[PDB]
Amino acid sequence: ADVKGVCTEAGMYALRERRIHVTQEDFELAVGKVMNKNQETAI
Amino acid sequence: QNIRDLEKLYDKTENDIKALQSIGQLIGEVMKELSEEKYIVKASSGPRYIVGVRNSVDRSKLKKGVRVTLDITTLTIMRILPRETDPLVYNMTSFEQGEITFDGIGGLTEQIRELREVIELPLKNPEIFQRVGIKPPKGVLLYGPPGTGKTLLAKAVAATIGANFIFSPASGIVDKYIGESARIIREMFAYAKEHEPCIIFMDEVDAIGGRRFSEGTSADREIQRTLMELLTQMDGFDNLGQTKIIMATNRPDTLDPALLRPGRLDRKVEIPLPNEAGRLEIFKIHTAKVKKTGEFDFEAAVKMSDGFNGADIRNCATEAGFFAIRDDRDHINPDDLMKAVRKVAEVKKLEGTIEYQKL
Amino acid sequence: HHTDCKFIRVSGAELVQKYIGEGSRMVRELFVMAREHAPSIIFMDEI
Amino acid sequence: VGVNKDSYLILDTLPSEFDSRVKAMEVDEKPTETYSDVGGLDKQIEELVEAIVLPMKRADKFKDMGIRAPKGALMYGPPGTGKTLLARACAAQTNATFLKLAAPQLVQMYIGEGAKLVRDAFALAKEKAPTIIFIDELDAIGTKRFDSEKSGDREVQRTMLELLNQLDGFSSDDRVKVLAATNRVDVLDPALLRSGRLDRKIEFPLPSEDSRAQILQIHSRKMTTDDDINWQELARSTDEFNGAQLKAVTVEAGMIALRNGQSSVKHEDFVEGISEVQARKSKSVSFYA
Amino acid sequence: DATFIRVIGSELVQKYVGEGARMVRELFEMARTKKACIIFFDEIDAVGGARFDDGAGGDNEVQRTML
Amino acid sequence: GSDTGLAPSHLWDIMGDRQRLGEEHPLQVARCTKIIKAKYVINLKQIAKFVVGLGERVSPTDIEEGMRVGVDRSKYNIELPLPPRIDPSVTMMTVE
Amino acid sequence: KRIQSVPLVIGQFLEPIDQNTGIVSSTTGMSYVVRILSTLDRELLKPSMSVALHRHSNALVDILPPDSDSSISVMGENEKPDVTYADVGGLDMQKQEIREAVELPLVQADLYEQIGIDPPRGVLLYGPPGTGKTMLVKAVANSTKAAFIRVNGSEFVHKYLGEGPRMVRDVFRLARENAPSIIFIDEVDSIATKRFDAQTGSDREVQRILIELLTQMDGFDQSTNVKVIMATNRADTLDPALLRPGRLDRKIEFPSLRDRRERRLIFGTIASKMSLAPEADLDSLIIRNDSLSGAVIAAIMQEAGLRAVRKNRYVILQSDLEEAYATQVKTDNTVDKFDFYK
Ligand SMILES: Nc1ncnc2c1ncn2[C@@H]1O[C@H](COP(=O)(O)OP(=O)(O)OP(=O)(O)O)[C@@H](O)[C@H]1O
Ligand SMILES: Nc1ncnc2c1ncn2[C@@H]1O[C@H](COP(=O)(O)OP(=O)(O)OP(=O)(O)O)[C@@H](O)[C@H]1O
Ligand SMILES: Nc1ncnc2c1ncn2[C@@H]1O[C@H](COP(=O)(O)OP(=O)(O)OP(=O)(O)O)[C@@H](O)[C@H]1O
Ligand SMILES: [Mg+2]
Numbered sequence A: 001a002d003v004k005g006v007c008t009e010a011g012m013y014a015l016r017e018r019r020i021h022v023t024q025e026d027f028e029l030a031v032g033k034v035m036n037k038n039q040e041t042a043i
Numbered sequence B: 001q002n003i004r005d006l007e008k009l010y011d012k013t014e015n016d017i018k019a020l021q022s023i024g025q026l027i028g029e030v031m032k033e034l035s036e037e038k039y040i041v042k043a044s045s046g047p048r049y050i051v052g053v054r055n056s057v058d059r060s061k062l063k064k065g066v067r068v069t070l071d072i073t074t075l076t077i078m079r080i081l082p083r084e085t086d087p088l089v090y091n092m093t094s095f096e097q098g099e100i101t102f103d104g105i106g107g108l109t110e111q112i113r114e115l116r117e118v119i120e121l122p123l124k125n126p127e128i129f130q131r132v133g134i135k136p137p138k139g140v141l142l143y144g145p146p147g148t149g150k151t152l153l154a155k156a157v158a159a160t161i162g163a164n165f166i167f168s169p170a171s172g173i174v175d176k177y178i179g180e181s182a183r184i185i186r187e188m189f190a191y192a193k194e195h196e197p198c199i200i201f202m203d204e205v206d207a208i209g210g211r212r213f214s215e216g217t218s219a220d221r222e223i224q225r226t227l228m229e230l231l232t233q234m235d236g237f238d239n240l241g242q243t244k245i246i247m248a249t250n251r252p253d254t255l256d257p258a259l260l261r262p263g264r265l266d267r268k269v270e271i272p273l274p275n276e277a278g279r280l281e282i283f284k285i286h287t288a289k290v291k292k293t294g295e296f297d298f299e300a301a302v303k304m305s306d307g308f309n310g311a312d313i314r315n316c317a318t319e320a321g322f323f324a325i326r327d328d329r330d331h332i333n334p335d336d337l338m339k340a341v342r343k344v345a346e347v348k349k350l351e352g353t354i355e356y357q358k359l
Numbered sequence C: 001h002h003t004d005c006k007f008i009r010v011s012g013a014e015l016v017q018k019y020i021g022e023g024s025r026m027v028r029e030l031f032v033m034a035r036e037h038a039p040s041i042i043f044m045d046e047i
Numbered sequence D: 001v002g003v004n005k006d007s008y009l010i011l012d013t014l015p016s017e018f019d020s021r022v023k024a025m026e027v028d029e030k031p032t033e034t035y036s037d038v039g040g041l042d043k044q045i046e047e048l049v050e051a052i053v054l055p056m057k058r059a060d061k062f063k064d065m066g067i068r069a070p071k072g073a074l075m076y077g078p079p080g081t082g083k084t085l086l087a088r089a090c091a092a093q094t095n096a097t098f099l100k101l102a103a104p105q106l107v108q109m110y111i112g113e114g115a116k117l118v119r120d121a122f123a124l125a126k127e128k129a130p131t132i133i134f135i136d137e138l139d140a141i142g143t144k145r146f147d148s149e150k151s152g153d154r155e156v157q158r159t160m161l162e163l164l165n166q167l168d169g170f171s172s173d174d175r176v177k178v179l180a181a182t183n184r185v186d187v188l189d190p191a192l193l194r195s196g197r198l199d200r201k202i203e204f205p206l207p208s209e210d211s212r213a214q215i216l217q218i219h220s221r222k223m224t225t226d227d228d229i230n231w232q233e234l235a236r237s238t239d240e241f242n243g244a245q246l247k248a249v250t251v252e253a254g255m256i257a258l259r260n261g262q263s264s265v266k267h268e269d270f271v272e273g274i275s276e277v278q279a280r281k282s283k284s285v286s287f288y289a
Numbered sequence E: 001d002a003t004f005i006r007v008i009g010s011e012l013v014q015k016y017v018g019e020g021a022r023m024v025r026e027l028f029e030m031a032r033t034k035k036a037c038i039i040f041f042d043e044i045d046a047v048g049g050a051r052f053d054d055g056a057g058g059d060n061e062v063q064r065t066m067l
Numbered sequence F: 001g002s003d004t005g006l007a008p009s010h011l012w013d014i015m016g017d018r019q020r021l022g023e024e025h026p027l028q029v030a031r032c033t034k035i036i037k038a039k040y041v042i043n044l045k046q047i048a049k050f051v052v053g054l055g056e057r058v059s060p061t062d063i064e065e066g067m068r069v070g071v072d073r074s075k076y077n078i079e080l081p082l083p084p085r086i087d088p089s090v091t092m093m094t095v096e
Numbered sequence G: 001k002r003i004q005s006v007p008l009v010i011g012q013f014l015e016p017i018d019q020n021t022g023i024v025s026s027t028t029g030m031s032y033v034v035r036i037l038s039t040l041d042r043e044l045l046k047p048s049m050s051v052a053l054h055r056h057s058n059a060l061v062d063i064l065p066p067d068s069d070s071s072i073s074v075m076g077e078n079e080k081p082d083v084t085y086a087d088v089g090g091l092d093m094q095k096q097e098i099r100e101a102v103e104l105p106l107v108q109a110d111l112y113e114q115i116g117i118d119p120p121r122g123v124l125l126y127g128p129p130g131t132g133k134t135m136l137v138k139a140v141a142n143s144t145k146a147a148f149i150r151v152n153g154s155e156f157v158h159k160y161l162g163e164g165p166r167m168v169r170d171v172f173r174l175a176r177e178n179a180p181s182i183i184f185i186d187e188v189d190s191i192a193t194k195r196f197d198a199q200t201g202s203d204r205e206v207q208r209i210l211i212e213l214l215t216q217m218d219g220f221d222q223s224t225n226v227k228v229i230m231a232t233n234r235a236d237t238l239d240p241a242l243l244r245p246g247r248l249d250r251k252i253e254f255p256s257l258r259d260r261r262e263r264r265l266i267f268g269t270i271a272s273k274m275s276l277a278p279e280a281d282l283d284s285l286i287i288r289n290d291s292l293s294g295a296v297i298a299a300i301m302q303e304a305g306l307r308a309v310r311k312n313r314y315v316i317l318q319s320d321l322e323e324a325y326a327t328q329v330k331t332d333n334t335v336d337k338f339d340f341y342k
């Protein structure tokens, strides 16, 4: 489920810059955010 | 005055006949203006209708909410009746009066100040609340041990200060039928908006104040709907215009935390057990109407009445009066107050050791 | 889906009765209702 | 107000209508007990009559004293010592409405029905003032309030708080005395035990030594007793016998006398009944003393 | 030769609060309607719990029916 | 030539029209209330709370508060008092 | 056109069975199968409409402007709430999430379709009581250009059986007409509780209300650009049927703030509007890290202002801010009253 979350967050990140395509570095941003949330909510 | 009074009786009988000719009309609520002669009116029965209006009713004063009268046969709007007051609201605001004033309350002087800074100050000085910038408080949750003045304070507030008081019992809102446990609260809060300022005062709210269950029964689920309805009409998608809510209970622990949040229930004035000098005021107040027959130095009673709570001191006065009667004496004696104090103090052990936490 | 079997996903008797909107004393009420629509698969989750 | 079916004209007003259960609970025939049938209670009788009856016939003395008459008297005690019989005698002697009320009768089906019933009870009491309500077995609704998130009895607490608000609060009317005869005073909520609400807490103790003789004498009137029964000996024979445990002794003695064919009871039948009722309900087996 | 109304202890335990009290009240009214009746309250171990407090208000409905 | 009696037993005579034309058979049941000194207040379960007089078929002293009245359907009247309502679940607990 | 007299009963069209017959549900409570008048614009007989019915026949005779039967009304200007995004201090991530799940989907759906993501059609603002769940939505309504139909949860339930699902469908129809629009069903935990009693009329009506809500929300196609927002204090007491894709998926998690930066931001936001003295430091107030909520840290400043007013000072000082912390936040009790546990 985190993979789907990563993909959806990357799609949202592409929107945030008002862009048209999803990039690899936006994927990096999304995976970083998903990891941070997953490791935080484990508390 | 035979002929004249007989004519008066004739006028009464004629009025009875005129009433006999008259007919009733249903009451509904206008919710739309489809055209100049087509309105969508609700009915107290429940069904909606498409009703044609008369020719004399001013069409301008027909918006969502105005009560109107409907002819029973053809369902035609007749009158422009003003807003409604639910009978279970007049039966609440029409309490007797109360003869006790702020003098009758003893010991409680700091908490009286704290309560009055929210009940009287916003209603009579809304300018310091502006330049300072404070948001005017709404709720005052009086709480303390059972029998210290949490209700007598409300009676004093009703008699003193002013504003349209609405005394509210806890269970006096809950009805068997679905939703009526919340419609009553809705009309209670609607009446206040048309009678500003209002000092709506619930009481014993730990009936509908309980921590909402997660696996309660059907009964405890309909009450939670009432708690939601009450909760929203304090901080919901609307501002309480000029309504102050006073709220009293004996067990603040069993109160829903959403209701206890600072912002819905503001400054939580706590009424504690009377302490020494406070108890002397209670003894002086409650033993002033009684026919005192001595140098009533209540210092011994003050020392012995440890942990006594308000009404208990009145019970010592009552028991002293009883003891005076036991010897047929017509006025209490300073050594008969002592017996009553001892007797009440012995019974005080029957009560549970009153414990409570400062919220 | 590919085997073409109706996929029931009961997750609690109270939720089943609430969703179907009918009273029931024990959970086998889903069994008679599922026998009519066969083949079928009952999927129960966990936490 | 009565109103016509079709014209909806107000034909005539009507008296206030309470719940039909409230009309039934009003006592109609006065139970014939009198204070002469209750024995062993002298302090308790004097305390109750001087707290619930006296401020109803000669309230002018209290008004001259400028003192508030007590609301009601609690009647806690061990089971079977007269907590209910005293109420029967009080209803016999009094000259005011004596609405009886069993506490479980208050607890009802739907949300708020119990509160409505217990409010209508006090409304009816105020209507036919003065009154003496007799909420009985108060521990049925007077259980302590408690915090709980799992589940609770939040329905009965509604009736409890409604009763509290009717006893004291904005409405008093100060002319409706409320008696209550619980059995477990250790369970009652602290609010219900407060002053302003039930003030007098009359303790009903187990009968004294002479009290037992008085009880035996009272409950052996109808039966055909003999002229040689030593009531003092019987009273001493019973030790910590609580009230109805003596009426049971009388009944058992009569039953034994009837079984043995005697036309009238004797001291021996009374002693046999004492052994029958007592913790010797097993009896038999005189082995090893 | 008299009516012999039988009562199993578990039958006096309904779901909704206060229904056991109505159960017993209606039962006793029916018994009083007849000239001579015998009631056989059986397995009163069910509704027989001694009054006790535990903070959580344990099985207080059965206690209500019993009182 | 599932819901009937027994044709071989007959006993389903066609004289039921005689006990059928008497439209007094439909009688609203309702528990009486406060006895206004004579007018009676009737509390039809959920249709109304009518105030009604007698129906000449019952003695005025036969109706008391708490009794169930066979109220007439049209132009309501107190026709026939009925035995007090008993819960069905308390009925089979009677050994016959 | 004579049956269109002016006694009439408002009904709700449910299903077109034939060209000249339909299944309407009159407000009296019970459904009918009626004959449709052969003059109405049959292209307007959308499901859950607000058609009118003849009095004693129930034959469909007139279709109404579908924004007429609504008992709930679109929030206009007299009820326009008076809070701002600037006034709502803190909640930066929550603000961004609600903006990207509520406002942006309303404005630009083409970007969502082109990117490939699924536009959210429901948010479930939840958290501990006193965290701004209501206020953030309140600030949204003060800046949105879309209709803000505001229903209030328990307002759905009424004695009149059938006044539930009917008004639910009516509210959703009103939302669909004034698109774009935001529904703000509030305190939904009173309608969507998990446990259920299939014997009493209380639960069997809330059940129909929830079923109608769920069906209408599932009926949301890719278009109609109407978003649903509901807030609750207890997330656990919620039907899991409300937490599925196509229904409420995005879940905002309003936390009881513990970060120093968040408390600093919100304290400064509240202080800016008020009359803090120049020699008054909020940093001295926020030295200790508690579980302070977003609401208590405003009532504390209200209490400080009241304390200053009591001493006749018309500008609050540091000595009153210090005392305010001691009276509005003492303990949560728990075990901190017993030091030996740690
Ligand atoms: N400060 C006081 N001075 C004099 N009498 C007092 C005082 N406080 C309480 N009383 C007495 O208390 C009685 C009124 O009820 P009281 O205020 O004790 O109830 P409460 O604590 O509000 O009740 P509840 O437990 O139902 O919330 C009166 O008899 C009044 O004399
Ligand atoms: N002092 C007494 N004089 C005469 N009879 C007495 C006395 N005390 C008890 N009894 C007998 O007790 C029986 C009734 O007991 P009672 O109802 O008062 O007990 P209780 O414990 O208060 O009951 P409950 O708690 O169920 O209300 C009667 O048969 C009565 O004769
Ligand atoms: N970020 C914030 N900045 C300033 N004040 C805030 C903030 N969040 C909440 N508040 C305070 O919260 C109060 C309004 O209640 P709020 O909207 O926070 O309730 P809520 O958390 O939505 O409650 P509930 O769950 O009961 O509906 C106001 O007094 C306001 O000062
Ligand atoms: Mg009080």
Ligand SMILES: [Mg+2]
Pocket: D080, D082, D083, D084, D085, D181
């Ligand atoms: Mg008794």
Ligand SMILES: [Mg+2]
Pocket: B235, G130, G132, G133, G134, G135
């Ligand atoms: Mg809120």
